[PDB]
Amino acid sequence: DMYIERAGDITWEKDAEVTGNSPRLDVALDESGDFSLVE
Amino acid sequence: GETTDGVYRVMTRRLLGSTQVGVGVMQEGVFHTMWHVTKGAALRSGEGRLDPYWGDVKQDLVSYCGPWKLDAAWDGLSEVQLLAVPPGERAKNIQTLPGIFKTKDGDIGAVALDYPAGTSGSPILDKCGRVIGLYGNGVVIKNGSYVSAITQGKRE
Numbered sequence: 001d002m003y004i005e006r007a008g009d010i011t012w013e014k015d016a017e018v019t020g021n022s023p024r025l026d027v028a029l030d031e032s033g034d035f036s037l038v039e
Numbered sequence: 040g041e042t043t044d045g046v047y048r049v050m051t052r053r054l055l056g057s058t059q060v061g062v063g064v065m066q067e068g069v070f071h072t073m074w075h076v077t078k079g080a081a082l083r084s085g086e087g088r089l090d091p092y093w094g095d096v097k098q099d100l101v102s103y104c105g106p107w108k109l110d111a112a113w114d115g116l117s118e119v120q121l122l123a124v125p126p127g128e129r130a131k132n133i134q135t136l137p138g139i140f141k142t143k144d145g146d147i148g149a150v151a152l153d154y155p156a157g158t159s160g161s162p163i164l165d166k167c168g169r170v171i172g173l174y175g176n177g178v179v180i181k182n183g184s185y186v187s188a189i190t191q192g193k194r195e
């Protein structure tokens with residue numbers, strides 16, 4: 001029996017920590033909703 | 040139960056202790072999460088029950104109490120924020136410039152941020168605070184790291 005608990009408001013935070021890169025990848029999506037890399 | 044708009048943890052008592060299996064968004068009385076988090080099962084909110092309303096395994100999305108309400112899209116130019124809700128940890132906004140998933144059926148925004156599997160369903164937002172998609176379905180690239188698609192439904 002799954003249950004939910006509030007974790008916060010959905011708002012943009014000014015001066016939030018900035019990280020992560022922006023890769024461009026060729027991918028395929030199968031009928032089961034799984035993404036895979038196409039090379 | 041609690042129906043106030045916001046981000047929520049999805050918990051289960053089936054496994055050891057109380058385990059967080061994912062995250063979701065409550066908006067306009069509808070609860071939005073990823074299919075792999077709940078597998079479409081019913082949810083509890085206090086003494087109330089949330090019943091599934093719509094879902095699709097290929098999109099990896101599910102809505103409860105009503106149809107999918109989130110219809111904002113990434114503009115393809117601007118930075119976004121992942122409002123990450125990791126298991127046992129406080130909600131935290133992380134700003135990033137999305138990458139791209141190029142598919143035979145079009146391009147999708149992607150976020151290269153590494154979080155535990157129980158973070159799936161955390162919302163990705165634009166500068167107006169609108170949810171442009173959910174984090175948690177993507178791929179593992181060469182280094183072993185994670186890149187998630189920005190998964191968004193359709194508002195009928």
Ligand SMILES: NCCc1ccc(NC(=O)c2cc(Cl)cc(NC(=O)OCc3ccccc3)c2)cc1
Pocket residue numbers: 032033034075099154155156157158159174175176177179183184185187
């Ligand atoms: N048919 C769809 C089923 C499905 C089922 C599940 C998922 N999602 C995940 O598994 C998931 C979600 C998030 Cl937010 C992060 C990760 N991270 C990830 O895989 O990182 C590599 C790694 C992990 C742990 C230790 C070492 C390396 C996974 C998607 C889809």
